[PDB]
Amino acid sequence: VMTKEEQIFLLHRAQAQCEKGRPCLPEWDHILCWPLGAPGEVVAVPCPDYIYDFNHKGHAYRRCDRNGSWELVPGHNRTWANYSECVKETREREVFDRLAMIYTVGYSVSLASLTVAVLILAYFRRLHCTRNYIHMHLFLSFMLRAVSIFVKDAVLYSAGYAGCRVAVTFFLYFLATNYYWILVEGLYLHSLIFMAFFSEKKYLWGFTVFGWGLPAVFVAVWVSVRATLANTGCWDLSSGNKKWIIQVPILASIVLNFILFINIVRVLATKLRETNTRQQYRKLLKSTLVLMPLFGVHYIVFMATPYTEVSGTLWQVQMHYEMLFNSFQGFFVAIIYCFCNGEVQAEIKKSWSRWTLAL
Amino acid sequence: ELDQLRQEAEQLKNQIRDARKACADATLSQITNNIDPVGRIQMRTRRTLRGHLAKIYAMHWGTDSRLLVSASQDGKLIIWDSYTTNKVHAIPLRSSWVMTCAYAPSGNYVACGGLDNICSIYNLKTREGNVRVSRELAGHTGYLSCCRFLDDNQIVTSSGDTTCALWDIETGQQTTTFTGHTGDVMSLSLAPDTRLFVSGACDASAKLWDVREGMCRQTFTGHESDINAICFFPNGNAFATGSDDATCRLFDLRADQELMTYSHDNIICGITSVSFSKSGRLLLAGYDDFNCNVWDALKADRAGVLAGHDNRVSCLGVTDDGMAVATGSWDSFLKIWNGSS
Amino acid sequence: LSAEDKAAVERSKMIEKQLQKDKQVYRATHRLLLLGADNSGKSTIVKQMRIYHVTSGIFETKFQVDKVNFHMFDVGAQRDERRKWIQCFNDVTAIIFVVDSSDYNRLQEALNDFKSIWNNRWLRTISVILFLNKQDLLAEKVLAGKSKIEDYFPEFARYTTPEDATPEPGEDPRVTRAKYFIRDEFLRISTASGDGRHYCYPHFTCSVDTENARRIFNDCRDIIQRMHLRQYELL
Amino acid sequence: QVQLQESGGGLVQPGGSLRLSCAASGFTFSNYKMNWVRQAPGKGLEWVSDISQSGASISYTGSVKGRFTISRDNAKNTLYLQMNSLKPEDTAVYYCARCPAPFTRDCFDVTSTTYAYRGQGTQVTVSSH
Amino acid sequence: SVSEIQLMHNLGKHLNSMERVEWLRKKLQDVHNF
Amino acid sequence: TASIAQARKLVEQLKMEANIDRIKVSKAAADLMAYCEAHAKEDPLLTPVPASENPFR
Ligand SMILES: CC(C)CCC[C@@H](C)[C@H]1CC[C@H]2[C@@H]3CC=C4C[C@@H](O)CC[C@]4(C)[C@H]3CC[C@]12C
Ligand SMILES: CC(C)CCC[C@@H](C)[C@H]1CC[C@H]2[C@@H]3CC=C4C[C@@H](O)CC[C@]4(C)[C@H]3CC[C@]12C
Ligand SMILES: CC(C)CCC[C@@H](C)[C@H]1CC[C@H]2[C@@H]3CC=C4C[C@@H](O)CC[C@]4(C)[C@H]3CC[C@]12C
Ligand SMILES: CC(C)CCC[C@@H](C)[C@H]1CC[C@H]2[C@@H]3CC=C4C[C@@H](O)CC[C@]4(C)[C@H]3CC[C@]12C
Ligand SMILES: CCCCCCCCCCCCCCCC(=O)O
Ligand SMILES: CCCCCCCCCCCCCCCC(=O)O
Ligand SMILES: CCCCCCCCCCCCCCCC(=O)O
DSSP states (O other): OOOHHHHHHHHHHHHHHTOOOOOOOOOOOSSOOOOOOOTTBOOEEEOOSSSSSSOSSSEEEEOBTTTTOOOOOSTTOSOOEETTTTTOOHHHHHHHHHHHHHHHHHHHHHHHHHHHHHHHHHHOSTTOSHHHHHHHHHHHHHHHHHHHHHHHHHHHOOOOOHHHHHHHHHHHHHHHHHHHHHHHHHHHHHHHHTTSSSSOSOOHHHHHHHHHHHHHHHHHHHHHHIIIIIOOSOTTSOOGGGGHHHHHHHHHHHHHHHHHHHHHHHHHHHHHHHOOOHHHHHHHHHHHHHHHHHHTGGGGTTSSOOOOOSSSHHHHHHHHHHHHHHHHHHHHHHIIIIISOHHHHHHHHHHHHHHHHHO | OHHHHHHHHHHHHHHHHHHHHHTOOOOHHHHGGGSOOOOOOOEEEEEEEOOOOSOEEEEEEOTTSSEEEEEETTTEEEEEETTTOOEEEEEEOSOSOEEEEEEOTTSSEEEEEETTOOEEEEESSOTTSOOOEEEEEOOOSSOEEEEEESSSSEEEEEETTTEEEEEETTTOSEEEEEEOOSSOEEEEEEOTTSSEEEEEETTSOEEEEETTTOOEEEEEOOOSSOEEEEEEOTTSSEEEEEETTSOEEEEETTTTEEEEEEOOTTOOSOEEEEEEOSSSSEEEEEESSSEEEEEETTTOOEEEEEEOOSSOEEEEEEOTTOSOEEEEETTSOEEEEEEOO | OOHHHHHHHHHHHHHHHHHHHHHHHHHTOEEEEEEOOTTSOHHHHHHHHHHHOOOOOEEEEEEEETTEEEEEEEEOSOOSOOTTGGGGGTTOSEEEEEEETTOHHHHHHHHHHHHHHHTOSSOTTOOEEEEEEOHHHHHHHHHHOSSOHHHHOGGGGGOOOOTTOOOOTTOOHHHHHHHHHHHHHHHHHHSSSOTTSSOBOOEEOOSOOTTHHHHHHHHHHHHHHHHHHHHTTOO | OOEEEEEOOEEEOTTSEEEEEEEEESSOGGGSOEEEEEEOTTSOEEEEEEEOSSSSSEEEOTTTTTTEEEEEETTTTEEEEEEESOOGGGOSEEEEEEOSSSSOSOOSSTTOTTOSSBOOOBOEEEOOO | OOHHHHHHHHHHHHHHHHHHHHHHHHHHHHHHHO | OTHHHHHHHHHHHHHHHHSSOOOOHHHHHHHHHHHHHHSSTTOTTTSOOOTTTOSOO
């Protein structure tokens, strides 16, 4: 589609094109170089053809009446013209508002649960460990992603100002960091299971650097590309294929995390077979379901889905599925790894019992 | 022959039992009903010593009530500053399976030992401040369970071979050998005068030994299981012992029998360490339930509980001045407790 | 902060750096415990792993497998009573239990010892590696036929070889039957309790095969992986 | 003081029956596990049978499985071992041993050379005359 | 694809377009008379 | 075997413990009570010391 700004630069260019029984002197109705004028002229000029709207087919009927003098049937008016042949969205706005509501509720619930879990894990010192450190990092990344999405929704909705681009780049960076932390979780799990183990549990600094820097690295790369090549208005509008600079890394991370999840499931099944049945199948299903939200397996559904049109079943179902699952992932992970964890429950029980006995 | 010997032994045991029962005119719990109760005692953790990697097995306090040594099975013997928590020395041990440590009364030497059956003594006042093994004591056929310094040249040690020996650091050879136990000697406690000391073994029996003479004077068999801990009353006339029966028993040398028994139905876990306060009124005993209890030495009532450990409290020591109590656990952390008004 | 306090803090920081180095070196290493009666080939496996590398109280033997250092301790001089010093090994990586499979008359003693080590209060979370050592002697005794397990174990008359048995190609059905019967007798004691927090890894050993080190390495790797997995509540 | 006094023994024809007994004192007999041990002439101590605190779980060695019956009376604090169909190989001094600690499931060193909480045992000789 | 980077792009276009139409309605209402 | 030697040694030890001047529990308990009452004020644990003197702040 044309941008409104381009459609008025076009009209300015169109306006400038002709800047400078009776044959009349056109009319120039703030749109179109139509120099037609004649004693009894029926002027059936075609549609603008330079405007994105006003479909090109058909013709703007107007009339130099008799004598070549603009017809005017309505009293006390200046002229008359059948400039309606050319001229002859709520569902999109409704679905967008519904997506906004659902994913906002989801992100708010996730933020609440995640801040609660972060406070819990930070208070108890016994839980301080590399695993809990990465869990707190993931929770903080989710919370920052949610807050950045909120700020973006507040700044953009409800021309190249600084706040717009700042909010856009912050949201992009926080989303990238969240995805990279989701990937680092699976990377650390695979390390502890396979190739490593008998090694260390401390590549911790390296994992943190990979989770924080490289997101910022390619985010700054994309920002520089956008500011040097196009730099047109806010950065929320796609201009060319430069959008893939931040999306290709995210897709690579998602596929790598899915492969790591498959490998972990295979290792778990092999080990369950080793130590030994319907109970074995039930335990394997439970473990798989519990590990699913950690690796973000739901992203594998629409990973390779292209940019489908808005008025499409695939687009709508994808948007619903994503805005639901990606939003509730924070809540699910928070629950699983802070209320369903035996160590956290035991620590909370101990603290509550000691507080009650002291009081 | 053996039949007559066993008959004579049983007759002498019955005679000793009758003699002990004849003097049992009144129990401590009966006369102590007119003494004011101590009430609930609340203590908080003032210092949290961390840095150990393996389960802490033993510790000992210094005569100055400032420095303390903690022994862990990680192969390290660290000295901690109870006030500022700063570490003074980190002695690397040759044997990682250390089970006990001792701090010299003068603060010049420190001992340690364990499954290696060797008592390694390290000097803390070397010429260049480089701690090194001053003397290695060998000869015991069992794991070194406990040791306590009598002076800068003599040290008593207990081993799992059911025998204790009086060592000489200058020469490095046993001076006196104390025998009579049938089970593994867990720990011992020296009297304030260093002339007599008591020790417990894995036979539900505790014996009194003479350091100068080396002869057993009295034997107490009030417990039902192995005696793990033992502490001497500040005056040197009585002592309490901890056993796996979840019950502490106070024994008197003059009466030659038990005075009080400290146990609660809810407690069914074994006892790990015991200690007497400066006055002796408070009997602090560690338990395997991840916490420690403070028992009234005169009322036999739970005055308080020192909880907050992630594992069993393997050791417990009170300062010479009673300013605070140190309790170590297998969680690699050592907690120092002290009450406030 | 006074000068004395500053010097003390500097000494404490140096000690902390030394302790951090020691912590790295310790977490980089693993420990093991070797148990078994005198009739078992404990010293044999000790010498085997020593010469290859791949009074006293306690002996120590260090060997490396795939750049991983392992420490195995063997009781050389200690009293018969083991209820006390056994608690010291409540945090080891695994307990290597060697048994003389050819000693029928003493097999019950080994079974009782394994049951005691398994049902201990402090060894509830420590895995035990069961090595059915001296398989050649067991095979020779079974082929001879002079002594039969039916006398020492009457229930053996009804035991059948498991379906998942993988016997040595040149192995007689009787030898595999007897060895799997012993393995199942040990497992029934190992599997009678535990709730899955600690497992047993039985293996057939002869005290001369060089793969003992590889077997111990694999057992330690499996144990460490299962422990890491239990932290995530996946097992 | 903990003491165990075994009872029963003497000459008994092979294949007959013999009932042993042990008197417990100095401890709460109900809070400790009881195990039977014997020492055959020329051999070391060997485990015979065990009985739980309440007697729910009972086990016997393969040599005496189905031949001996172990039972305890928490009220009387006495342990019994009903032995029937004795064999000449059963000749051994039967010793009664107690678990070192209460409320536990493992009898570590009940069959030790110098156990502390065990009785003197009684002579049991299965010989045909 | 990234569903959140996409939703942002899709909304950008709806909104701009609307401005392209609302502006179109204005020039229509303007050209109705003038 | 040293069984006879051990039996004879135990008999000798019993006689040493039998011939001793034992004291009634009434007096032994009274001494401990008097000791606990005398040094009660000198026990920082039994009686909390003000924070100004307590070194463990
Ligand atoms: C039940 C929980 C634990 C799991 C499922 C997530 C919940 C929160 C989801 C499932 C269905 C969702 C609703 C589906 C449709 C709409 C209509 C929209 O115009 C406003 C949001 C609203 C009302 C959603 C709110 C969130 C919702 C209730
Ligand atoms: C996704 C990452 C992690 C792996 C693949 C390499 C990345 C960096 C590659 C793959 C495709 C690439 C993009 C393809 C095309 C364009 C359009 C051009 O006008 C600006 C650069 C830009 C936007 C590229 C930037 C770098 C890019 C995103
Ligand atoms: C893409 C979405 C919708 C579906 C994916 C389902 C996943 C969870 C499925 C697909 C393939 C499955 C694996 C296939 C084979 C095995 C080997 C077996 O010994 C243990 C289970 C295990 C390891 C399965 C675990 C679950 C698994 C990974
Ligand atoms: C798994 C790792 C190794 C590789 C992942 C491959 C990624 C980069 C692939 C998989 C699906 C692909 C997308 C599939 C379809 C389209 C629509 C097209 O109009 C633009 C490119 C675009 C948007 C592709 C970009 C690259 C893409 C995201
Ligand atoms: C680092 C922690 C800070 C947490 C940041 C989240 C605080 C909520 C901010 C939400 C702003 C949303 C604005 C919506 C539009 C408006 O009401 O003006
Ligand atoms: C370093 C900590 C600071 C935390 C920063 C987050 C504080 C919230 C700022 C949100 C600003 C969003 C502006 C929305 C538009 C508006 O209302 O003007
Ligand atoms: C959350 C996972 C289970 C539910 C599946 C998510 C999508 C279900 C329905 C999506 C709406 C599809 C659009 C067509 C019309 C409609 O149903 O609203």
